[PDB]
């Protein structure tokens, strides 16, 4: 993982696609 | 239902069920 | 049989929500 | 180092109720 002085991290996964309800 | 002999069947409608979409 | 089909139900539309998204 | 695991997989319920195949 990338290393340097320490400050404000969080890991976090984002997915999203645009679609409309099936019914 | 009705219990006979293997023969032709009438169309029935189908309604569907309201589900979260998948997407 | 036992138990009647459920009752045809119209489809209702749904309207999206804007919201923010970091991608 | 160690590779970067996969996403993060979204579970999801689906709600379904049995009927006559249509094929």
Same mark, same amino acid.
């Given at each position: 993982? &990338? /290393?340097?002085? &320490?400050?404000?991290?969080? #890991?976090?996964? /984002?997915?999203? /696609?645009? #679609?409309?309800?099936?019914?």
């Amino acid at each position: 993982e &990338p /290393v340097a002085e &320490p400050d404000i991290m969080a #890991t976090n996964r /984002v997915v999203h /696609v645009i #679609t409309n309800v099936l019914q």
